């Protein structure tokens, strides 16, 4: 999954020539706690949080925002076409509250906060296992959907000893969400390896005939 | 997993009698963007974020924090024994910046933010590929560990041309993490079909 599918596009875009008062007004209008500072060409030159702006005297509201920003050299960034897990590892390692998103041209086009990642996770939780088995089916090869369902029935008969027909399994994965299946398998690892075993049994059964 | 496993006990707690200056200094010291306002018994009296204190005058630095806080009715809370999915759903639904963790009698004992959920997610990417291969070995059956390692070597010599021994691959997956593995395979799908092919070669031999 790409970063551009998680990112916040309603971010406060501060320009390098603006004052502290301008930045405060934009941050309060946009309901954001951090913001990138860009130039006229929308290229990143800085980054600021509302923490560094607290306690400022009103006589200093006319100071340029460049006197309170982090220069771009010290700013954690990510590209729009990177994989989604990259921003996760960066979030955990560097503990920054937001990460600007750049095009493959150097321009700021979004922001990623932890809440965007959490939103995406909440969306993945509710995906039916049916979708996971379709995306799985795209990579197995010359295996039919019925053969895959049969293999999944064999695997469940090996795991839990339950005798189930392929159609009942299809209905079951249509009714089961991703997170509930992860919880049933006992973790994302055992679910992943379970899918591996299902694919393996499928390909083996296909080789047993030809 | 419970809120117990997600919550942080080190947070910024502001008392109802403190001033705006104290709240600003505490938010800066704790590096937090929001905080609850509690009474003498640590019970919820309000909440505040940096945006409520942003752009105010130097005169307001001595006013009580009650002049800028927000009403309790806007605060979404959780209990320590609530499910983690519940605080996730409350994060997504109410789009709030932080969620306090209360006792059954209303005392503020914890704080949950989105970055705690993210931090617990990241643990998945630190798993060594060795353990994934262990679970796979438990799911294969007739193949032994040495045979599975030999198969992995045969496959790596095919995909990349590297002449690697089973022990070298053992140390390799012992010292490479799941995140670096799916990064080096070009995506989760190719790591997945790689494991499938390794198991297949192991079964054929």
């Amino acid at each position: 999954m790409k970063v551009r599918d998680l990112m916040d596009k309603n971010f406060a875009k501060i320009y390098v020539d603006e004052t502290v008062e301008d930045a405060i007004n934009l941050l309060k209008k946009k309901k954001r706690f951090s913001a990138p500072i860009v130039d006229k060409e929308d290229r990143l030159v800085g980054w600021v949080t509302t923490l560094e702006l607290l306690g400022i005297s009103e006589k200093d509201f006319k100071k340029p925002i460049t006197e309170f920003m982090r220069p771009v050299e010290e700013v954690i960034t990510v590209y729009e076409d990177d994989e989604a897990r990259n921003v996760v590892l960066k979030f955990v390692k560097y503990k920054v509250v937001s990460i600007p998103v750049l095009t493959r041209d150097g321009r700021v086009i979004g922001m990623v906060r932890n809440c965007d990642v959490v939103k995406t996770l909440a969306k993945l939780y509710e995906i039916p296992v049916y979708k996971i088995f379709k995306e799985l089916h795209n990579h197995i090869g010359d295996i039919s959907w019925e053969e895959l369902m049969e293999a999944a029935a064999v695997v469940t008969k090996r795991m839990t000893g339950e005798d189930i027909t392929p159609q009942e399994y299809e209905e079951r994965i249509k009714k089961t969400t991703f997170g509930k299946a992860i919880w049933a398998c006992g973790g994302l690892e055992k679910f992943f390896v379970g899918l591996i075993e299902i694919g393996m049994v499928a390909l083996a059964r296909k080789l047993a005939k030809r």
Side-chain angles (χ1 to χ4, degrees), chain A residues 25-51 53-58 60-104 106-141 143-145 147-156 159-162 164-209:
Chain A
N25 290 329
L26 180 60
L27 287 167
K28 288 164 67 67
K29 166 180 178 177
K30 286 294 193 174
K31 261 61 185 177
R32 292 298 181 269
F33 299 85
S34 61
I37 289 92
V38 304
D39 63 6
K40 58 217 294 187
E41 303 258 1
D42 274 16
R43 291 190 245 86
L44 190 63
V45 310
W47 185 77
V48 75
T49 62
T50 56
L51 271 183
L53 298 177
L54 286 181
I56 297 180
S57 181
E58 59 270 44
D60 303 328
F61 284 168
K62 295 296 164 54
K63 291 183 175 180
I65 196 57
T66 49
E67 292 184 13
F68 298 87
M69 69 176 190
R70 290 244 302 269
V72 55
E73 298 84 40
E74 311 166 3
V75 174
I76 306 299
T77 64
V78 71
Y79 291 93
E80 77 158 274
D81 61 341
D82 279 345
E83 301 293 318
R85 52 193 108 97
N86 302 17
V87 313
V88 174
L89 286 176
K90 297 184 179 186
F91 274 139
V92 177
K93 179 180 175 180
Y94 298 97
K95 303 185 178 186
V96 293
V97 298
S98 59
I99 297 170
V101 182
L102 310 181
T103 46
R104 275 304 170 178
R107 296 164 45 252
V108 184
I109 57 158
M111 293 268 280
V112 180
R113 303 153 298 171
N114 286 277
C115 58
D116 302 314
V117 179
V118 169
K119 200 186 309 174
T120 304
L121 291 175
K123 240 173 296 182
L124 286 176
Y125 191 94
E126 309 293 338
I127 285 305
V129 194
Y130 187 80
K131 311 292 182 182
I132 310 300
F133 271 93
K134 285 288 182 180
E135 184 61 88
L136 158 64
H137 188 207
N138 285 340
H139 293 70
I140 298 298
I143 282 291
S144 80
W145 183 259
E147 293 168 322
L148 184 58
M149 293 301 101
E150 292 169 356
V154 171
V155 170
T156 45
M159 298 289 294
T160 72
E162 174 176 24
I164 180 179
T165 86
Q167 292 75 22
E168 302 172 351
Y169 196 90
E170 168 176 75
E171 183 181 352
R172 179 172 294 186
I173 68 175
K174 283 179 182 174
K175 295 178 179 176
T176 304
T177 68
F178 190 18
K180 182 167 181 55
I182 301 172
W183 176 85
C185 287
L188 198 38
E189 306 146 272
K190 297 187 178 182
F191 177 83
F192 184 69
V193 178
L195 289 180
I196 302 170
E197 176 183 29
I198 293 183
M200 288 185 52
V201 173
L203 290 177
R205 291 170 69 93
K206 186 51 175 289
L207 259 62
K209 303 204 311 175

